[PDB]
Ligand binder design. Structure first.
Ligand SMILES: *Cc1cc2c(cc1C)nc1c(=O)[nH]c(=O)nc-1n2C[C@H](O)[C@H](O)[C@H](O)COP(=O)(O)OP(=O)(O)OC[C@H]1O[C@@H](n2cnc3c(N)ncnc32)[C@H](O)[C@@H]1O
Length: 541
């Protein structure tokens, strides 16, 4: 690969390396980018000032799992961009148990698994964890990362825990900010009006460290079911049988993975226990995360199907879905993983980077908890109709599963330190005009990158969701980390990117704390737009 132009008078003590860039899904691949690993937060400041003086941009580089082009854009000229790998050195972790609520301070490059592993050593933990522990905390906060957790009916939220996004747990953070004449480190407390836009910032701000509250750790069971027909699981409100709503009411945490052209989803249900005290007799105790080995490692017949699909055989979809379901059903049985139990992190962390690479569509439906069944029944029935509609024309734009899970919102009551409010632009931010809306229902669809017609379908779905879930009883918000603004390619519908996202985030909230308030804060902190790229300029001018 041709060497990139040498950056002018780059700091001599900050080593620069030319490396390729590839996000997890591999949808974003650049043969060359400049990368460095700042040893301390002050080195990021030095980078920012150097970047400003030479018209270069700086992007923090976490675990590179990002689908949304917030680091680098596909095919973009990055001759004037420096990527700052934060996981090399900015990964310190310190637990603070002296105060009103326990907290943990971590460099922005520390992985969430590393953070919660340390919390576990102090009998502490987080209630709503994202599925993969490899994510950097900086990258997780940037998109209001979350899990599939909700408290069961009657279950109280323990002091320190939140069922909203990880962004709601921040008690303080430090970022590189313009002080009027130069960039410098600045720290903000949760009771500081200037902090809310920074809690979920999409990488528009460069965080060097964060402090987050933690609640007591807890034991949790995770039961899997693959014997419930989809129409029963996703039935109308009040239906009898093994319904999604009944699982959420009884256990709180739940996630369904429904493979294309299959009869029964893989349903996971998490239940908190009331040192084996509380372990269900039938459950297998685990002492580590990632207990679904069959999903993080696929056999030849399956890898061959994936290879053939990539070679231009989308018609394999009707065989691929069932094959994935069978691997799951058989794998869960063979490894005795249908009923496991252990500490929170061990049953909530279940996705390894080795899982099949997929791209996603869909989003979040913010509404009242009593509306869960209806939202899910409507979506699944619509999806079912659409996939068959295309099959009827000999088209297979969908070869990945439908994934559905709910969690809470960034409730103010969960914050145990003085606070001015929830993250300004998190999809999990409560709606003031609708106090009864207390859950976020994540409706996602996954598919193999490059599948013909897939993005056209995601656009069709995005349009249906916006029209269907924006009413007096619910609001639709794209999941920042996934695909959205499909035009048809994700992030290319100019009207959605430059007008509708703003509209979504000014709706129902004060003019003193909305999308515009956030943009203003981001620009005040970085008036020279050092922490941006082309896409960010369209989304957050
Ligand atoms: C790959 C993947 C991701 C994923 C998932 C499963 C897989 C296989 N499961 C998720 C889950 O269960 N729940 C959830 O909410 N998200 C899940 N994701 C998506 C993941 O959260 C996002 O992709 C996340 O942003 C990725 O974090 P990562 O650590 O990989 O970071 P990155 O791609 O480099 O950058 C992502 C964004 O974060 C900003 N960023 C990164 N570091 C910082 C610092 N220091 N300061 C400010 N912003 C930061 C980047 O700019 C970018 O916008």
């Amino acid at each position: 690969v041709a060497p990139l132009p040498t950056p002018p008078n780059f700091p001599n003590d900050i080593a620069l390396f030319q490396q390729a860039y590839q996000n997890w899904s591999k949808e974003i691949m650049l043969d060359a980018t400049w990368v460095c690993s700042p040893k301390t937060p002050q080195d990021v400041v030095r980078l920012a000032n150097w970047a400003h003086e030479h018209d270069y941009k700086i992007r923090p580089r976490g675990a590179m799992h990002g689908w949304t082009p917030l680091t680098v854009e596909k095919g973009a000229n990055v001759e004037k961009v420096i990527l700052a790998d934060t996981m090399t050195h900015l990964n310190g972790i310190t637990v603070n148990t002296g105060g009103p609520v326990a907290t943990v301070t971590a460099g922005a490059g520390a992985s969430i698994e590393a953070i919660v592993t340390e919390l576990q050593k102090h009998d502490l933990g987080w209630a709503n964890l994202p599925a993969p522990g490899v994510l950097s905390i900086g990258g997780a906060l940037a998109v209001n990362a979350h899990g599939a957790a909700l408290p069961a009916v009657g279950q109280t939220t323990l002091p320190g825990h939140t069922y909203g996004s990880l962004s709601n747990l921040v008690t303080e953070l430090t970022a590189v900010v313009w002080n009027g004449t130069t960039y410098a480190l600045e720290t903000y407390q949760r009771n500081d009006p200037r902090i809310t836009p920074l809690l979920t910032n999409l990488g528009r701000c460069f965080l060097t460290s964060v402090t987050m509250q933690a609640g007591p750790n807890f034991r949790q069971r995770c039961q899997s079911y693959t014997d419930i027909p989809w129409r029963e699981l996703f039935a109308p409100k009040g239906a009898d049988g093994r319904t999604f709503e009944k699982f959420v009411a009884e256990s709180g945490g739940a996630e369904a993975i429904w493979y294309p052209f299959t009869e029964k989803p893989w349903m996971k249900v998490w239940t908190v226990s009331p040192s084996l005290v509380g372990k269900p007799p039938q459950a297998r105790e685990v002492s580590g995360p990632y207990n679904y080995i069959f999903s993080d490692n696929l056999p030849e017949p399956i890898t061959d199907m994936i290879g053939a699909i990539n070679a231009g055989n989308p018609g394999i979809a009707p065989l691929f879905g069932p094959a994935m379901y069978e691997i799951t059903k058989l794998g869960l049985a063979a490894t005795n993983a249908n009923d496991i139990w252990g500490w929170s992190k061990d049953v909530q962390f279940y996705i390894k980077a080795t899982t099949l690479r997929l791209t996603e569509g869909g989003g979040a439906v913010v509404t009242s908890r009593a509306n869960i069944a209806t939202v899910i029944n409507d979506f699944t029935e619509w999806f079912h109709e659409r996939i068959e509609f295309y099959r009827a024309k000999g088209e297979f734009p969908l070869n990945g599963p439908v994934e559905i899970r709910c969690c809470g919102l960034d409730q103010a009551a969960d914050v145990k330190v003085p606070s001015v409010g929830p993250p300004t632009i998190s999809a999990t931010r409560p709606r003031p005009d609708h106090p009864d809306w207390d859950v976020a229902i994540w409706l996602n669809v996954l598919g193999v990158p490059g599948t013909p017609g897939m993005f056209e379908f995601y656009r069709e779905m995005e349009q249906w969701m916006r029209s269907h879930y924006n009413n007096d009883d619910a609001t639709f918000r794209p999941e920042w980390s996934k695909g959205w603004a499909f035009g048809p390619d994700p992030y290319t519908d100019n009207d959605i990117v430059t007008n509708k996202m703003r509209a979504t985030y000014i709706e129902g909230v004060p003019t003193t704390e909305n999308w515009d308030t956030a943009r203003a804060r981001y620009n005040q902190i970085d008036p020279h737009r050092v922490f941006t790229n082309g896409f960010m300029d369209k989304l957050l001018p």
